[PDB]
Symmetry: T
Subunit: 67 residues, 12 copies
């Protein structure tokens, strides 16, 4: 029947976790069609003087393949 594909992206953001997820999804929407779900694989980040510099959320994004 239907077939899906999953790509692995790493969304980053200095705001927070949800923000990094959205950044990844925002860029994904630009070149992928029929985005359906995502799965967080990892949550890491860089440290700066104020603490968390950038939050990086590794995630898989699943989308339906046309035909």
């Amino acid at each position: 029947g239907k077939v899906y594909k999953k790509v692995e992206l790493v969304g980053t953001s200095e705001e927070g976790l949800e923000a990094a997820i959205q950044a990844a999804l925002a860029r994904a929407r630009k070149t992928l069609r029929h985005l359906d779900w995502f799965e967080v694989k990892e949550i890491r980040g860089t440290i700066g003087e104020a603490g968390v510099k950038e939050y990086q959320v590794v995630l898989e994004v699943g989308f339906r393949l046309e035909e």
Copy 2:
């Protein structure tokens, strides 16, 4: 001595991670007694036109069993 039980729930929310966790704890409180701790096992979600539609946090809820 004491014995605990763990149930796996999946809390969802359109607002965020914490929210989805709280939603699962909220509903757990209604039928489970002596809730002690939780563990997040997965963080996934659905995608909509605006990006994240629903955040789904799969977690285990540990509670003490009565004798």
Copy 3:
């Protein structure tokens, strides 16, 4: 060449996930030099009357070592 070391900490907070992470980092800054990055290993917490009492994020902090 360079060499890094990783330490495992557990930041806690009643505010949220990001907060618990910053708390760990904050305290790490006090005794460790050259903090570079962090990795989230686990996300767990305690349950109170109002739901989540305290969020506990187990994370590894990596930092550069002096030759």
Copy 4:
């Protein structure tokens, strides 16, 4: 929002994998309401003189919690 629960079952069958999955789902339908999805965790079995005696499929079954 909505909250789901997952229970772990082990469906068995001498016919095959799909059969063992269905056996588990058949019994689940008897006492659980709003079954939505399943996830295969393990696939094992017992050996007899003709080879596979019983196929055992360990799976999690997710269902929506009412209210």
Copy 5:
């Protein structure tokens, strides 16, 4: 054919691992029928002045589900 169910329990004991395990099974027997096997998932515990205060063994208990 047959269909089993697995619940996750955490047995505790100040004595030792084997005790923690039995503690969890003892309580399991009280409300579950047809217990068949168990699998240890984690072994952890609390620390006191004398060392290990309590041993906590997280395990899964498998049991046979009946007809209806």
Copy 6:
């Protein structure tokens, strides 16, 4: 020497496991060249009134890249 690439697909089918795998390979053949092997990563599915509604097999498909 030679280099291969792996894509993650999710083949679905209402008939069975093999079927869902074939569905993913079928669609992969249409846009990928030199398909060599596959690996099943997860087996999950939806539930309907009759039990299993759709079998979903997540798998990785390996293929040789051209120079």
Copy 7:
């Protein structure tokens, strides 16, 4: 008391998953005594013109040892 041993085999077949498993078991019966149970570790395969050429199921076979 009793003691078991586990060996890792890889059954193959062009028919299907169950077939590949029986093939491994069949051949195990020829040199091993007291086969008790098996565990599926991986499911993979090769790709041909018609889709799946050969299904390969990596499994562990456990059997009782003679004192």
Copy 8:
């Protein structure tokens, strides 16, 4: 230089964990030479009327190979 080999065994015993391990080692000593180390992979068991019927410890035994 030296080359070792590892075999996976499952020691059983109604006494306890240490017992089950010893049982496996005892039987291993009978057909394997130069036993050096072991690694516990799993700990499970059966359940009887008095609780633990038998303790089963899955472990790998490593020994040096001759040449």
Copy 9:
């Protein structure tokens, strides 16, 4: 709020698992303050003529850190 640190130790013992664990905790209380819990990560060991020579239990010890 509070912050904890975890260190990985390997307690050995010729007696048994619980012993190996206690060994590690004993040594741990000598240089670490506020020990709270432990998590067993691996269980391995050396083989001797009598079977198990020494039981080695890899565990993580978690303790609270002082702001100072």
Copy 10:
């Protein structure tokens, strides 16, 4: 902010691990822009009469995605 992408490649080489890795990156450079890091997932290979025929290193290559 920035968003990266990861593709999984399998570099092969009769020379050694390091070579297999470079082989995969070399080919990666041909069609991917802004390569930043790689992570080794598996190390396997084929066996010949002389021993290792080919080393195969499965790895993930991370790269920065552009604006549009």
Copy 11:
């Protein structure tokens, strides 16, 4: 159809990873027929005054079984 068996070996070497691997395969071809592939499971080693004393690579060797 065909059936393969996998054995776990640990190849050691003071030279390097690839060497350790070759060591294991060399010994393997002495008592096993039809070796086809290997999979590295772990990489560990012993420490000496000069750093790495011996590299130990745990790997699984897969070979085809003969019906007979």
Copy 12:
């Protein structure tokens, strides 16, 4: 009896895998006594114009503690 401790380090090097490991050991020898064994946990690295910029090997170093 004896008690060991393990620290996680990340050796780096532009030369190779063995180099990166040695680097970490070298630096470990400077502040840790009785180094016995190491375990490789991860192998990653950065990418430059010539391919591998630097090899990074995450490993745990175990040493005996005194008393």
